Amino acid sequence: VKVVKNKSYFKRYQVKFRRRREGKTDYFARKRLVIQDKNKYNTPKYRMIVRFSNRDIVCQIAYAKIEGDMIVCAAYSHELPKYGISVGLTNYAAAYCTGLLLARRLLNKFGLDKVYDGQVEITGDEFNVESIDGQPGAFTCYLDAGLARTTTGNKVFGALKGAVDGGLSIPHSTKRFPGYDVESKEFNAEVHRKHILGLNIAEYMRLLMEEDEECYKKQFSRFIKNGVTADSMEEMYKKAHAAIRENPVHEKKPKREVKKKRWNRAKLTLAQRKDRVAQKKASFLRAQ
Amino acid sequence: RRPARCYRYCKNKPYPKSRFCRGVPDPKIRIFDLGRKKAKVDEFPLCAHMVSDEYEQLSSEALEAARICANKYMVKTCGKDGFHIRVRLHPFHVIRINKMLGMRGAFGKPQGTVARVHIGQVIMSVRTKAQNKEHVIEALRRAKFKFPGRQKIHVSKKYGFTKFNTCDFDNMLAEKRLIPDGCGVKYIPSRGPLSRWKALH
Amino acid sequence: AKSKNHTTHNQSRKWHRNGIKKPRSQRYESLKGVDPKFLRNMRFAKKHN
Amino acid sequence: TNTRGKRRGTRYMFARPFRKHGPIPLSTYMRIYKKGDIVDIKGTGTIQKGMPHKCYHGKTGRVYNVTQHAVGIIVNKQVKGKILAKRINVRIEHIKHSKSRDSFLQRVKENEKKKVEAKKEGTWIELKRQPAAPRPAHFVSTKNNKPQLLEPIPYEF
Amino acid sequence: VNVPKTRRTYCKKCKKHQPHKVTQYKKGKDSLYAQGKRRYDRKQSGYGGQTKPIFRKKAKTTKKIVLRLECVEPNCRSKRMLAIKRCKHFELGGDKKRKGQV
Amino acid sequence: NKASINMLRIAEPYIAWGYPNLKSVRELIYKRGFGKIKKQRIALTDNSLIEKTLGQCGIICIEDLIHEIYTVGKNFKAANNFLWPFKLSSPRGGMNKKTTHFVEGGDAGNREDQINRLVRRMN
RNA sequence: CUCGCCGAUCAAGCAGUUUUAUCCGGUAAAGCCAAUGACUAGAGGCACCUAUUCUCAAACUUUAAAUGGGUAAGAGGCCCGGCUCGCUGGCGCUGGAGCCGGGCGUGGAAUGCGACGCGCCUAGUGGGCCAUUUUUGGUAAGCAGAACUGGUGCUGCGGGAUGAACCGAACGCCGGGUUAAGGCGCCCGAUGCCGACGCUCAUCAGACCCCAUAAAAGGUG
RNA sequence: GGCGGUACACCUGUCAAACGGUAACGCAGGUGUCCUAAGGCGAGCUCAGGGGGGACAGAAACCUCCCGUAGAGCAGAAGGGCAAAAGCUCGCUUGAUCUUGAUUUUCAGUAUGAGUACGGACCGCGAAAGCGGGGCCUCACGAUCCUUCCGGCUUUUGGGGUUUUAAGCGGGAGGUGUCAGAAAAGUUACCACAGGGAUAACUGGCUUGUGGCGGCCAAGCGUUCAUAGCGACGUCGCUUUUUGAUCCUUCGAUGUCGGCUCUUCCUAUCAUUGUGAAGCAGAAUUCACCAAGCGUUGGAUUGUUCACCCACUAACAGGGAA
RNA sequence: GCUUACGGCCAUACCACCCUGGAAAUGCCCGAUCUCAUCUGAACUCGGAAGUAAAGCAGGGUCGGGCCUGGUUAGUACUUGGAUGGGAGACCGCCUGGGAAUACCAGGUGCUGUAAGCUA
Ligand SMILES: [Mg+2]
Ligand SMILES: [Mg+2]
Ligand SMILES: [Mg+2]
Ligand SMILES: [Mg+2]
Ligand SMILES: [Mg+2]
Ligand SMILES: [Mg+2]
Ligand SMILES: [Mg+2]
Ligand SMILES: [Mg+2]
Ligand SMILES: [Mg+2]
Ligand SMILES: [Mg+2]
Ligand SMILES: [Mg+2]
Ligand SMILES: [Mg+2]
Ligand SMILES: [Mg+2]
Ligand SMILES: [Mg+2]
Ligand SMILES: [Mg+2]
Ligand SMILES: [Mg+2]
Ligand SMILES: [Mg+2]
Ligand SMILES: [Mg+2]
Ligand SMILES: [Mg+2]
Ligand SMILES: [Mg+2]
Ligand SMILES: [Mg+2]
Ligand SMILES: [Mg+2]
Ligand SMILES: [Mg+2]
Ligand SMILES: [Mg+2]
Ligand SMILES: [Mg+2]
Ligand SMILES: [Mg+2]
Ligand SMILES: [Mg+2]
Ligand SMILES: [Mg+2]
Ligand SMILES: [Mg+2]
Ligand SMILES: [Mg+2]
Ligand SMILES: [Mg+2]
Ligand SMILES: [Mg+2]
Ligand SMILES: [Mg+2]
Ligand SMILES: [Mg+2]
Ligand SMILES: [Zn+2]
């Protein structure tokens, strides 16, 4: 069988971009998202970056530059325990809060927290903030889903709804919000308000506790020890949205000084490298 | 056929047999290695060439004739298993022939293949034992009369058909830098994996 | 009765006879071909200052 | 007679370098081209839109118009014996900033500071480039480098 | 080359995209009292023979198809000629392509 | 300089240049010395002609004109361009070969200090 | 005709040229143990498979010249303040462009030149030919077809005996002097040198750009 | 010249000598089409090939794992480009629409064709940024007059008015492939005219493929022995008594095939004179050398040069001189 | 120093095999009620937190392949311009300038911007 990886293979081999080899960036969609028109002359084109891990949600606002895009404001999902949400830091309701936390924190540093307060109450209807004359214009950014398949009800659009309710003017439509019946092509806003306030999570805690309590303890183990029940879901997120709108500013942790103690071994120098093969040759000639 | 005086000088760009040039007849020479070709490097230390001194092109029929002329003299003076002839010129340039005759559409059909040679390029190479030097020079001398132009019969300083000198070939064998494989040697540098170094020892 | 097809023999001597003059770059270049959206606003920046 | 096609003879100029194929790196898209800067022209076979003609690949002109995706350039093209200023529309993937004037701008900024430094100190530093002058008189020491005898080598074939 | 019998194109009289009825354009019979025909008969009358060139060496095989886009608006029955590239076979009804078929 | 040396290299087959000494610079401006007063080949028969044209550069006589050319000064361009090209005669004694380079027995090219011999036979 | 004429009292600008700075290319060469295509020979591992090897490409190439093409080398600059806009927009400067005012000559590479500046009218020509180099078809051609430059056509003169184009050199009428290329036995101006060294004998000697013919192979001359 | 071909309008690679341009009846080719999707957009997916496997099942059916820089595919010729694309599959679609100017390319910097970047409408797809005014790019096409259709928030039909009709302005189409666009079968040996050595048929000239002639090397032939006499495979030259190639001279004319006649020259010598060599015993014959002084015939058939035969002969050699 | 989000240059970053590591974080992992989703909860989407390093990932190892850089190849090949240079010719030498490429040899193997967190 002929060898596929020979000298002629690697000599002709052209590697992809590093962010492409890692599978993190889609350069076909990035070009159409971060590149600004040439008749704008360094007008920053902002975008909301929403990323999901197995335990955390990252929401950032950036604008592209040649030496790397700068992050204007970043709100993480592990900051919700400061506002009350100590459980389920990766569900749809926690995505609406980190988007709201990113919207209110951005408007704070830009001096736009008095104007464009968004929807204080959660109604689920399509809301797009309006720019009032005389006052500074609303912040207009765009959504960056990345490699996440944008289906109806994805949590990427949960932070999108949290940002447009905070005051951000992001263009979108209610076709991909949870509660859009594609059969009738109508958006039922009442279903969306349930996912925003975690009401769909409460119905799961009740469907298990009233059927078999054994599985309820495995699925919601940390929900029991933290003292949150199925009846304390809607109110928990409501008072969390209130705390986010009050103090959205995030202070950095005190810089802890470290002696920079390395835990990895260093590369072998040229002396240690040649001396090792010199010992293997000498040890090979003694055995014969 | 047309005499070789008409296709002696390299006037045209190289016109090889390819997808665009179809219908080329087979070259006159088809065998390039003769003698005991499956001999090791330490059997035929001597090497002698037929170096060219003119930038011209040698026909395929001349390479065939001079090969047999040098071969018939080596088999009678050194035996059929005491030499190795390697013709180092392959006929690749296709010379053209105009229609048998105005010149409306004068581009001609292929006539044959002709090997283009440079000043200093080896035409033939013969390796044999160290005591057959006077026979190879005479065998290669008789083959010059089958070629147009001027050729030189130079006894090379390399070790047979290899590219290493004779004064260094014996030292590179003891240092395991060269291993014989058929009619040539393998240059084994000191920059590979250590597994193949232990195989040599 | 064939003739000569194409030639550029004496052309380089005729070009440099009166010299090869570069285009005259005048101050205040023209404004034809510019973006009509940009020119429409620029004419509004001149009738208001 | 040759064909008058727009891409005849562009087999190698519009090709991409070895092991440099694929998508365009996203730095060429985020470069700002104002109106009146010197830009080069170098066509790319990846973007078949707004590509320049082969008579402009390698030329250099100044920008007179900027649009959404492209840039209007004023290139001087000699036709037969006359040089004409051509206004062409080339997208930003086939152009780049010309560093031919950056050596002049850096030299001006260094001149504007040398005269204000000599004015407040009272010197006469000359601000003007000069060709490579003949080498001055210098002593060549032979303390540790004695002249080594060279001579032609015999001919060997 | 088949085109559908319906087009949602721009209507110049409605100044808006409207559904259109697609139909192939036919030249129609010549009028006997057009200016060019009224002077061609008068010039060719009497003696002298044929006075106008008669085109003989035809070279084209097919011609460009013209679509007659008529708006389906009840009050705006505005037509418009739309031309397509040359084609030797043209059907207005046609059947849509089917990929996954034997 | 490197700007002018490459101009002499590109025109070697047509020139025969070198390094003139003082006597060559001296005798060329005295015997073949003609000044360009107003686009005219006026003979330098009086220092009033030099002081009128090159008075701003400090050159007020024919000796300053020689010193400004032999020892190249800050006003070499104004002094050299003031002098009309010297109309030298045919070389008395003949040339070696006008076609080949001086190194290969001819006359063209660069002769370091042997240009003085060519001046005495042409001036 | 508009100017400069006054030389960098002045702004200058220009160039079949270099220098400095920055881009463009895929030809010569090189490579094929790198891809596509062609190709010779053994060797190892159980026809293939791996590592080598000989020879090539004009419609192949990793690499890649020389020559060459474009641009930039200042007042139309540099810097600062204010104003205008329906364009742009988190951000009366957020970009952008326009407008107005002020500050700053050590005109900020070499060489050369009045700008081959701005127009108008316009004859002739639209069969070319030759050479160095590059190059296509052809066995070749005082052949046919291209590229750069020169010549000639339109051009006489010194030299090549002779001559369209070769070498030198281009031309008002003359005196003197001196050269080019080429020459200096005599025709025929000049070696009528006590020119230097060596090679060479030919019963077809040899005698110099283009150029007016000579080869392979041989000689104990 | 004719016949053939289209190098007549266009496209790819090369020629082309590293910007662009650059010729020949240069080279290898392609075009007068195809597509309601093979146009537009979004999403998902990864291809060619190879290996291990898996009822029927095999070298080719289908399922599945692994490797797989694209070595596949992208309607066609070729080149370039492309991998969460530009390929494959799928569901929504008509930016293949309506408009003014600028501009690139062939260029005279004219038209047309084909392209590029915008402005103003109205829309498609997408969560969105965005993308799209046909096909991934380089090709796939057409003036004036006339006809025909569409459009007007409209004009004239004239001494007014009304209605038909006709004319006009704006945009498509009908087509000129000789493709910047005549409506067009031959013959002339009965031929004419204006011209052309810009151009053929003679000589001459350059060229020598071809023809003829002569060397070099030595496998072999020669009973044996490479070279007395020959010289395969190769290769170097000469000649202008072959025929081409070219088209410089000659078309206000150079009389043109053969024979007859007559003179002269050349030697690549058939004979004779003087010699060398042998597979030279003699005779005969063959090879070669100095050598063109001298001779080289009479006839049948054919217009023939060239052939073929009959006899003679020391031999009946080969050519040049327009 | 490390772990993530978004990147710039796009192999000094890739490829094969081996070894070590979980503080935070990351990954695997546990479920199919809701949203969504396929032949199949594998993927996609969604809900979650019992386990903690097998793999991803990160850091090392290889007289590693590749890539990058330098030396050398070589002032060689080739080339601008010049001659009444050589040569029957093919072609070559010289004068005046520019000046490569493989093989071979050696060294190196990601750098870095913005934002957040942790001191294995
Ligand atoms: Mg070598
Ligand atoms: Mg002509
Ligand atoms: Mg012609
Ligand atoms: Mg001319
Ligand atoms: Mg072509
Ligand atoms: Mg009648
Ligand atoms: Mg000359
Ligand atoms: Mg000025
Ligand atoms: Mg003409
Ligand atoms: Mg004319
Ligand atoms: Mg002549
Ligand atoms: Mg010619
Ligand atoms: Mg001719
Ligand atoms: Mg003239
Ligand atoms: Mg002569
Ligand atoms: Mg005189
Ligand atoms: Mg004489
Ligand atoms: Mg002999
Ligand atoms: Mg002797
Ligand atoms: Mg054809
Ligand atoms: Mg060129
Ligand atoms: Mg638009
Ligand atoms: Mg001849
Ligand atoms: Mg012959
Ligand atoms: Mg025998
Ligand atoms: Mg013989
Ligand atoms: Mg023979
Ligand atoms: Mg003959
Ligand atoms: Mg003629
Ligand atoms: Mg004789
Ligand atoms: Mg003989
Ligand atoms: Mg472990
Ligand atoms: Mg390595
Ligand atoms: Mg290297
Ligand atoms: Zn309508």
Swiss-Prot record, chain B:
Its main location: cytoplasm. Disruption phenotype: Morpholino knockdown of the protein decreases head size, but not body length at 2 days post-fertilization (dpf). Show decreased formation of actively translating ribosomes. GO terms for biological process: brain development; embryonic brain development; regulation of translation; translation. The keyword Ribosomal protein applies. Keywords: Cytoplasm, Developmental protein, Ribonucleoprotein, Ribosomal protein. It is found in: Cytoplasm. One of its GO terms (cellular component) is cytosolic large ribosomal subunit. GO terms for molecular function: structural constituent of ribosome; translation regulator activity. It comes from the Eukaryota. Pfam families: Ribosomal_L16. The keyword GTP-binding does not apply. Component of the large ribosomal subunit. Plays a role in the formation of actively translating ribosomes. Plays a role in the embryonic brain development. Belongs to the universal ribosomal protein uL16 family. NCBIfam families: PRK04199.1-4 (NF003239), uL16_euk_arch (TIGR00279). Component of the large ribosomal subunit. This is Large ribosomal subunit protein uL16. It comes from Danio rerio. The gene is rpl10.
From Swiss-Prot, chain E:
It is found in: Cytoplasm. GO terms for biological process: chordate embryonic development; regulation of cell cycle; translation. Residues 25-52 are annotated as: Disordered. GO terms for cellular component: cytosolic large ribosomal subunit. One of its GO terms (molecular function) is structural constituent of ribosome. The keyword DNA repair does not apply. Keywords: Cytoplasm, Ribonucleoprotein, Ribosomal protein. The keyword Manganese does not apply. It holds the Pfam family Ribosomal_L44. PROSITE patterns: RIBOSOMAL_L44E. Component of the large ribosomal subunit. The ribosome is a large ribonucleoprotein complex responsible for the synthesis of proteins in the cell. Component of the large ribosomal subunit. Belongs to the eukaryotic ribosomal protein eL42 family. This is Large ribosomal subunit protein eL42. It comes from Danio rerio. The lineage of its organism: Eukaryota, Metazoa, Chordata, Craniata, Vertebrata.
